[PDB]
Structure 1
């Protein structure tokens, strides 16, 4: 999501002659994402091809994917370079998967990508494989030792048990992933020598994915300070259960309750406080002083006392947080950067217009008819202080 959302890195990774999946978690519409593919295909040199990643998590995205898949359908009906589709966070049911495989863009899909997290999820994909035996299906088996979206399932035991049934389908391409930064450590899974430690006879793999080790890369949009942070983090051997920051890495749960692997060394303030607040919420009112100050430490600022705070302080706080002085929102608008906050600028307007709405005793003729003009209002907007 953060890493591959940039059209620059996914292009550069592909231009290096490598397979990559464009992130869909950073694209909220067909149009905004169609810009990325267009930026991709422009940065895509002749013939080179890439794939796309999608999430199963929420209904709104799955309804957006109906427009998204038809976008992928339209793109490839137009002959777009994107040669694959990646379903994430869950395995679609047979009728849902058949649809994806059999789409008008099917040949341009050329294979389908699934990411099973459990034994049952693996067995589900096997049934998707037997569905269309002539359709290539790349099964990426991840761990919970991996980054981001998490799981309680071991790296080995899952693949150790399900491998035999996975190889009874020729259309299944087995790909091991997670906790791999190097060719040396990942060489044994390729030779099949990795299963020998568990006594099982050799168990070779068809491919390997690297999520984490590519985050510190040059063409990645990761900030200079964030890269240095990922670097100095020391790594670990097989994941341990004991709750702590483990080798600069501690798990944490998202808003939905699912675990997320985040960096607890580079940033120790957000994760641990979150675990404090989460486990502490009954009595929050009692610890309010301790809790409200810690939000300010991680820069999740509450506002100074709500009543007593002057309307300036309100309106000056939004400008403070929304408008960066270094990036110069006015100068940020000119390149037409995707980082543009314009909803935040629109947010501040609705607050400004509310301020006029609150204090005006008269008919509201002079004030409202001015700031609402395009040419006039937009000029007023690029200069927040004025």
Structure 2
């Protein structure tokens, strides 16, 4: 505790350090404003239940009533009502991926599959995505009255953006959540969460810190450095629960992150984390709907150490490259032939402006058609007399039979979508 004994003009608004009078106070136990010691106050401890089973009591575990190890809500990953079900039955927390649901009729049908199957009393979260303002147009008015019906949806994690303060007030005050997750990617995104917690001092906020070494849509900043500049003023908000993720898969890996002994690599005080979320670890599990040949590919993809994940922008690093999405922000994906072909069109065609776009596709045409048929998952539609072609040189019957080829799964006698059946 720093006591500036020269100057007497207390109080600083953040109360980092004291002034002249704190030497002088004659109250017995009220004179000593203590400094926060991070290694003693919020260290992970153990606790037994009444049934004798042992938990790790952290600040994240105490709010949820279970182990400090949640499964992060992913679009493709967290979409199988079954991966969110029987991992809650294991006793672990999961937020439902809202991104793969497209109407409030379909999600309410999906939530009822969980609540009918998980134990009476368990709860799930809903991971929405803030850069889909269509999904917040129906999903947020869904959560307001579905919680008023009383369903066990207990939290709302907002990925891909931190809301403004007048919006995050409405996400806390009106609709009755237990806690609220936020996933910052920058220091200005972290300091915007601290702006939310000081507006609502008693409501829990689970700050989910993910670095750029995760999967899914990446981030530019390092994992360690932004929180190492911000851990001091996150912990001055006692409601913010800090959770670190982005690349955690084993007990020997992330025990230095819970205990806090990782920052003595960086000549800093021990900096314990309250909880740990899992991303790409849960995909090869039995109760996920990742394809069996796709799970074998992830097993074949050896990982990369943390010291060299920045070279993912150039080369396949362990079989995983980042690549540019529709609107520019990067996306970590595995390095198959189609995803390497995704990058070839990003460096060459997709970065061009509009005036050179139609001319570059004309000169690159039969080469693009070559690997849409061979390498990429969305084929080229034109196929006349077993020759690849343009669309306007196909008959109507072979237009229709190619729509049955590319939209109907003959092995399982079902359509990809009803709305593609309503297209054919």
TM-score when scaled to structure 2? 0.76
**Is 1:318 matched up with 2:403?**
yes
> Please, which runs of 5 or more residues in structure 2 have no aligned partner?
1-74, 350-355, 383-388
Q: Secondary structure at the match of 2:77?
A: coil
Q: Give 1:63 deviation, angstroms.
A: 2.1
Q: Give 1:300 deviation, angstroms.
A: 2.4
Q: Give 1:301 deviation, angstroms.
A: 2.2
**Is 1:13 matched up with 2:87?**
yes
Cα distance in 2 between the residues matched to 1:25 and 1:280: 30
* 1:357 matched residue in structure 2: none
**Is 1:341 matched up with 2:417?**
yes
* 1:327 matched residue in structure 2: 412
**Is 1:61 matched up with 2:131?**
no
Is the Cα–Cα contact under 8 Å of residues 8 and 43 in structure 1 kept in the other structure?
no
Q: Secondary structure at the match of 1:9?
A: coil
Q: Secondary structure at the match of 2:332?
A: strand
Q: Give 1:55 deviation, angstroms.
A: 0.5
* 2:297 matched residue in structure 1: 229
RMSD between aligned residues: 1.2
**Is 1:199 matched up with 2:270?**
no
Is the Cα–Cα contact under 8 Å of residues 91 and 114 in structure 1 kept in the other structure?
yes
* 2:195 matched residue in structure 1: 127
**Distance verdict in 2 for CA 1:86–1:142, change over 3 Å:** same
Q: Give 1:306 deviation, angstroms.
A: 2.3
Higher relative helix content: 1
Deviations 1:82-118 (A, max 9, x none): 1111111000000010000012x32xx1111100000
* 2:310 matched residue in structure 1: 240
Is the Cα–Cα contact under 8 Å of residues 156 and 179 in structure 2 kept in the other structure?
yes
Is the Cα–Cα contact under 8 Å of residues 112 and 137 in structure 1 kept in the other structure?
yes
Cα distance in 2 between the residues matched to 1:60 and 1:14: 28
Q: Give 1:10 deviation, angstroms.
A: 0.2
Q: Give 1:284 deviation, angstroms.
A: 2.6
**Is 1:305 matched up with 2:390?**
yes
If asked which structure has higher relative contact order (CA below 8 Å, sep 6+), I would say 2
Structure 2 counterparts to residues 1-386 of structure 1, below 5 A: 1-64=75-138, 68-103=139-174, 105-106=175-176, 109-238=177-306, 239-241=309-311, 243-264=314-335, 267=336, 269-281=337-349, 282=356, 283-297=360-374, 298-302=376-380, 303=382, 304-329=389-414, 341-348=417-424
Q: Secondary structure at the match of 1:11?
A: coil
Q: Give 1:278 deviation, angstroms.
A: 2.3
> Please, which runs of 5 or more residues in structure 1 have no aligned partner?
333-339, 349-386
Cα distance in 2 between the residues matched to 1:299 and 1:87: 30
198-207 or 71-80, which moves further after superposition? 71-80
Cα distance in 2 between the residues matched to 1:299 and 1:342: 20
Cα distance in 2 between the residues matched to 1:218 and 1:36: 20
Q: Secondary structure at the match of 2:252?
A: coil
40-49 or 152-161, which moves further after superposition? 40-49
Q: Secondary structure at the match of 2:403?
A: helix
Is the Cα–Cα contact under 8 Å of residues 129 and 137 in structure 1 kept in the other structure?
yes
Q: Give 1:322 deviation, angstroms.
A: 0.8
29-38 or 55-64, which moves further after superposition? 55-64
Q: Give 1:305 deviation, angstroms.
A: 2.8
Q: Give 1:296 deviation, angstroms.
A: 0.9
Q: Secondary structure at the match of 2:394?
A: coil
Is the Cα–Cα contact under 8 Å of residues 338 and 377 in structure 2 kept in the other structure?
no
Cα distance in 2 between the residues matched to 1:206 and 1:307: 60
After TM superposition, the runs of 4+ consecutive aligned structure 1 residues lying more than 3 A away are: none
Higher relative strand content: 2
